[PDB]
Each structure stands twice: as C-alpha cells, then as structure tokens.
Curated annotation (Swiss-Prot):
Protein name: 5-epi-aristolochene synthase
Organism whose genome encodes this protein: Nicotiana tabacum
This protein's GO CC annotations: cytoplasm
GO biological process assignments: diterpenoid biosynthetic process; sesquiterpene biosynthetic process
Origin: domain of life: Eukaryota
UniProt free text on domains: The Asp-Asp-Xaa-Xaa-Asp/Glu (DDXXD/E) motif is important for the catalytic activity, presumably through binding to Mg(2+).
Cofactor descriptive note: Binds 3 Mg(2+) ions per subunit.
C-alpha cells in the first residue's frame, strides 16, 4: 500500500557530502573517546553501550573489541548490579564467555536474587536485558527474567522520562532480540534525544549517520522497486502482491551497513521471488500443476518449462534468470561458484512446499518430529541465510560448507521462526482446513490442549534462543560476520510476530529530525 512512493529517489549529493564530511569529524572524535586512558569501568561500559544503542558501533569494531577483551581479562568486581549485568551482557554478546558467577553477590545462599535489589531500577533494567543472553549453563540466571520483569512492571508508572519509556519499551522488546535499525531508531529519537545527560557529540553523530545510511537504503529500495516493475508480475501474475517494500525491510533487518549494499539487493530479490512461489503453492496451483512445478525446480533446466502451465512458466523463467544475474554479478570477483548453494536450498524449500501441500490434501497430521523435518525448511530460513552470504565479499566456500551442515545456530534460528509462526497463524490455518499445522500435530502427538501445545512451542523457541546465544561464544566455527545474519533472521521473527508499516515508515520514510 506504498505505491510509487519509492519508485525513484534523487539523492541530493550536497546534503550527503555535508553529512559525510561532518560524520568524519565526529567519528574521529568518538574514536578518541573510546581510547581515553583514565576511565572507570562503569564509564567505559556505558560509553560502549551508548555507541551501540545509537547504531554507530559498526565504525568501531576493532576498538570496542580490544577494550572488551581487556575487561574480560581483568575480571574486576564492580559490586553493583547495574554495572555487573551490563558487563555480563556486553561480553556475552561479543562472544566472551564471562562466567555468570558475577551475579552470586546479588543472590542469597539459596541462589535467589536478593529481593532488596527490587528498588534498583537501573540494575533491574540491565539485569532484564542480560537475562536474554543466557545459555543452558547459566543456571544462576534462571529467575533473572521473572524477577526483573515483575519489579520493572511495578516501578515503571512512576519513573521520570525518558527512563520510563525505555523501561516500558524494554518490557515489550528486549534489546538483544530486536532488529538493530528498529532499536537504534527508537533509542535515538525517543530516549537519548530526551536524555538530560546525553553526550551531544554522540547524539549528533548518531543522527547524521542514521540519516545518511537511510539515503543509501532508499537508493537500494528504489533500484529494486524498478527491478520489480520490469518483471511486470502485477499483470502477468495477478495472484501475488507487491510485497517488495516488506521484503526490503527483511533484508535491511539482516544487515544495514553500507558494505552490505550488494548483499541486501541480492537478498531482497530472493525474498520477493520465493514469495511468489509460496503464493503459487498456497492458493493457485492445483495438485498436478504443483507436482509439475516441484519437478521443474529440481531439474533446474528451462526445457522443463514446456510441462508447466503459462503462469508457472513466468515464475520459473524469472527464477532461473535471477540466478543467472547473481552469477554474473559475482563474476568480477570470481565468486559465482557459490550461487549453487543458494539454488540447492531453494530446491529444498520447494520440495517441502510440495510435501506440505500433499499433507494438506491427504488430511495428514504427522507427529511433531516428522512435522518439523519438513516444516522447518518451509520457513525459508536455511535458504535466506544461505542467500545472505551471496553478496558478502568475504563469504568463502568453507563458510557455505559449514552452513550446509545445518549448524546448531542456524537450526535454532529456523526453529524460532517455525514455532512462533505456528503459534501465531494457528487459528487462521485451522479455519482453512490445514490440519497439518504445527500446533495441531503437537496436540495430537502429545495428547494436550492447544494452550499446552503453544506453551511447549514457546519453550522450544526459548531453548533455541539459548542455543543461538551459545553459538555466538568464542571460538566460533566461522567469523562472527557470518553468524550475525542468522541471529538477525531470528530477531526479525520477534518483530514480525509481537505490522511492518510503522517500522518501514520509521526506517525508510521518515528521517530523524536533526
Ligand atoms: Mg505455502
Ligand atoms: Mg503457520
């Protein structure tokens, strides 16, 4: 419902250059802040936390890492909940397996959190955020979420602004599980901007940087929108909607940095394309047509097009063409040889789409284990994760080989999307006759109520998050650069099922008022 609002974006080079020039000054100035010698732990942690929440930490990957490494190594006891929880969270998010023992001093000989901390809002907030980065080994943090949650909920109504808005927001969306750009936009405009103790250099820096990057995101969105119009699916395939803007939001959620410009464009096209296919199997193709389509996809030829009805011929050709473009784009860098990994994942998605169709027609309700073996791939997550690597100039063959083994971190990301999707779309899918819905299989397989089935599904998502958190800890199998996209895919789930309009507006329409 966007229209020609994004067909084309004429970037006024003057404003961009001004922004860039000043950003360079602010960047160097901020760098010097990070390298300040005589700073206290609390101050150093808050500085890093602020730069990250402001969405400008990508400029200081090395600096922040070296500083955090020093903090990890010195193991200093801060003694106060606020700093301890923050220290724990930042180290964990950066792969440092800091021991949860740092929380023992805030617990009774029973391991329960000293209820006396219940009046320490700042400590509770940082503990709340830290509880979301826990692993299966962090037994000490078992009751951290419930503890901080109940007390923050109680204190919230009487807190000053913007602290109150920060707490209220956190309770609805924790930092660790939120989409980066979405959380950055919120922190900048709704919190830091209204913070009495704000650092003006950092705020100015954050605003300019966000706005400048937004211009690039707009060029990409415009470029891809033109690409979509050329395909002219609107008239040739009147059963699919112009979801391009939504598809772009997803790509933006996976990575927003300027270096991933090519990657985002490639990713958007894939998301758009597979969306067409999903529509085909869901409400247009007949039993026979779908079987013919699944086969054509597995063969991946073109001569197979003759066995497909006209509408499917358009889709099929476009898909094959898209991958040819990908191969061409990567030719200059000699990376075209990796595209096959994405194709293999697409074939997988289509096979499982077909199987899902078959299950629906037969009225089959498989046990959970069997349901998942097919339903996990239908989320398209393995496929999208593989696709995100295509445009990443550093993604080597080894990285793709690791990804093909279905790494636990990827598996967890996929599971999160699956169980959450099933919990949300259950009602709609049931009234549609889809008795092969995750929640349905769960109920029958275990012999439990819908409520209990959904509760089990939520537990699976929780378990998966802990797995993701563990998968981020050093030593990582591949560079962190390749783990973030998977983590971001899981974050997108949290945002899509708490719909995209407000985020699209805040991220791609409205700039932050400087
Ligand atoms: Mg479908
Ligand atoms: Mg579903």
């Amino acid at each position: 419902l966007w229209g020609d609002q994004f067909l084309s974006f004429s970037i006024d080079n003057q404003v961009a250059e001004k922004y860039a020039q000043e950003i360079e000054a602010l960047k160097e100035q901020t760098r010097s802040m990070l390298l300040a010698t005589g700073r206290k732990l609390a101050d150093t942690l808050n500085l890093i936390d602020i730069i990250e929440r402001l969405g400008i930490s990508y400029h200081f990957e090395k600096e922040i890492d070296e500083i955090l490494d020093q903090i990890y190594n010195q193991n200093s006891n801060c003694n106060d909940l606020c700093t301890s929880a923050l220290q724990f969270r930042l180290l964990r998010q950066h792969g440092f397996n800091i021991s949860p023992e740092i929380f023992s001093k805030f617990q009774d000989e029973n391991g329960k959190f000293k209820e006396s901390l219940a009046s320490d809002v700042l400590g509770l907030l940082n503990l709340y955020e830290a509880s979301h980065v826990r692993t299966h080994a962090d037994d000490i943090l078992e009751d951290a979420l419930a503890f901080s949650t109940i007390h923050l909920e109680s204190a919230a109504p009487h807190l000053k602004s913007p602290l109150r808005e920060q707490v209220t927001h956190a309770l609805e969306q924790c930092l660790h599980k939120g989409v980066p750009r979405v959380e950055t936009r919120f922190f900048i405009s709704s919190i830091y901007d209204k913070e009495q103790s704000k650092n003006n250099v950092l705020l100015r820096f954050a605003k300019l940087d966000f706005n400048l990057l937004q211009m690039l995101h707009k060029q990409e969105l415009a470029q891809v929108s033109r690409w979509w119009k050329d395909l002219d699916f609107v008239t040739t395939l009147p059963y699919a909607r112009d979801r391009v803007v939504e598809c772009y939001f997803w790509a933006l959620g996976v990575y927003f940095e300027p270096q991933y410009s090519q990657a985002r464009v490639m990713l958007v096209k894939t998301i758009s394309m597979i969306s067409i296919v999903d529509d085909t199997f869901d409400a247009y193709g007949t039993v026979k047509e779908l079987e013919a389509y699944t086969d054509a996809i597995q063969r991946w030829d073109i001569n197979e097009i003759d066995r497909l009805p006209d509408y499917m011929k358009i889709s099929y050709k476009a898909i094959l063409d898209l991958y040819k473009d990908y191969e061409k784009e990567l030719s200059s860098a000699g990376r075209s040889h990796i595209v096959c990994h994405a194709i293999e994942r697409m074939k997988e998605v289509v096979r499982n789409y077909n199987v899902e169709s078959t299950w629906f027609i037969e009225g089959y309700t498989p046990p959970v284990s069997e349901y998942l073996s097919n339903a996990l791939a239908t989320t398209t997550y393995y496929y999208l994760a593989t696709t995100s690597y295509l445009g990443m100039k550093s993604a080597t063959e080894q990285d793709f080989e690791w990804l093909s083994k279905n790494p636990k971190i990827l598996e967890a990301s996929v599971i999160i999307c699956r169980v959450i999707d099933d919990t949300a779309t259950y009602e709609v899918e049931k009234s549609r006759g889809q008795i092969a819905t995750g929640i349905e299989c769960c109920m029958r397989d275990y012999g439990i109520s819908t409520k209990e089935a959904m509760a089990k599904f939520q537990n699976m998502a929780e378990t998966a998050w802990k797995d993701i958190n563990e998968g981020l800890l050093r030593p990582t199998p591949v560079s962190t650069e390749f783990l973030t996209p998977i983590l971001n895919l899981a974050r997108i789930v949290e945002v899509t099922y708490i719909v995209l309009k407000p985020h699209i507006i805040n991220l791609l329409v409205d700039s932050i008022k400087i």
